[PDB]
Structures are given as C-alpha cells and as structure tokens.
Amino acid sequence: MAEITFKGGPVTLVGQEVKVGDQAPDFTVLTNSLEEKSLADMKGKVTIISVIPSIDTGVCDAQTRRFNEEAAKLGDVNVYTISADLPFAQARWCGANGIDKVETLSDHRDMSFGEAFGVYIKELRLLARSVFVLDENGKVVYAEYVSEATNHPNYEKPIEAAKALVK
DSSP: OOOEEETTEEEOBSSOOOOTTSOOOOOEEEBTTOOEEEHHHHTTSOEEEEEOSOSTTSHIIIIIHHHHHHHHHHSSOEEEEEEOSSGGGTSOOGGGSSOTTEEEEEGGGTOHHHHHTTOBBTTTOSBOOEEEEEOTTSOEEEEEEOSBTTSOOOSHHHHHHHHHHHO
C-alpha cells in the first residue's frame, strides 16, 4: 500500500500502488510550455520520473535536484519532474536547473497521470511525492511512494533500476 502522510496527516491515493512490471496506461501530461505530451512520447527510451506536490516545498533541494542530476548522467535517459499546477511549483524547476535534459510537467491540469499512476491524492488533491523508472516500452521498472510527502526516498534505488536498463 501506497498511502502516504502529508505534514504529519495521513492521506489516501485515488488509483494507488503501481509496481514494477505492472505497465503504465498511456495518459497525457502538460509540459512547462503547456503543450500536451503523453507517455507514448516518452516511450522509445529509458525514462525517469520524479513527482512532487510543489517545488516551493524544499524537497527540490534534499533529493530531487540530486537524483535528476545523477539520472541525466547515467545515459541519454529521459528525465521529468511532474508537479501540481499550483503557482509555486513550475516556476523554478529545482530539478531542471543546470541539467537541460530535465523538463518540468504539469499533470494536475487533466490529472490523467495523477489517476493513472494513482499519485492523485484523494484527500489533498495534490500530486503525491513519488519516483518511477520506465523501460523503453513504458513498463515501470521502479515505483515508490514516500511514506511522508514532505520527506524524500532513497534515490540510489531508482538510479540502480535505471542503470540496470541503460547499461
């Protein structure tokens, strides 16, 4: 189970607990440029996806920044950071600053990724704090939901999962 806490309050997820091997549905997301992109546009290469409620939340610094920076060096992998619409959350791309390969995404506009990966928080209506790695067909090769959204996962584990493919 992929239930989480946010600020020390438990909160439920809508479409729950994707896991390794479960495959990814194909939904749509928006870019930082507000263009429609789908999972099918990511397919054809190994892909890495961080998910955060906002970037103002400081989780930028502690892990997402670093994880993305490492991810971008494993190889030519796609790297993404999905955020809420929330104004605090796309301006500044703490994950996508200095690593031009990273792009910030705005799923909350359509919630399609939110529902499809079950990271839409039922109680809070935010993107969950989560991290995923996908094979070239879009098959999830890592998934994690951080037990507290204001906290961060061990980021080596998705890096190893990505290494295991890229190599």
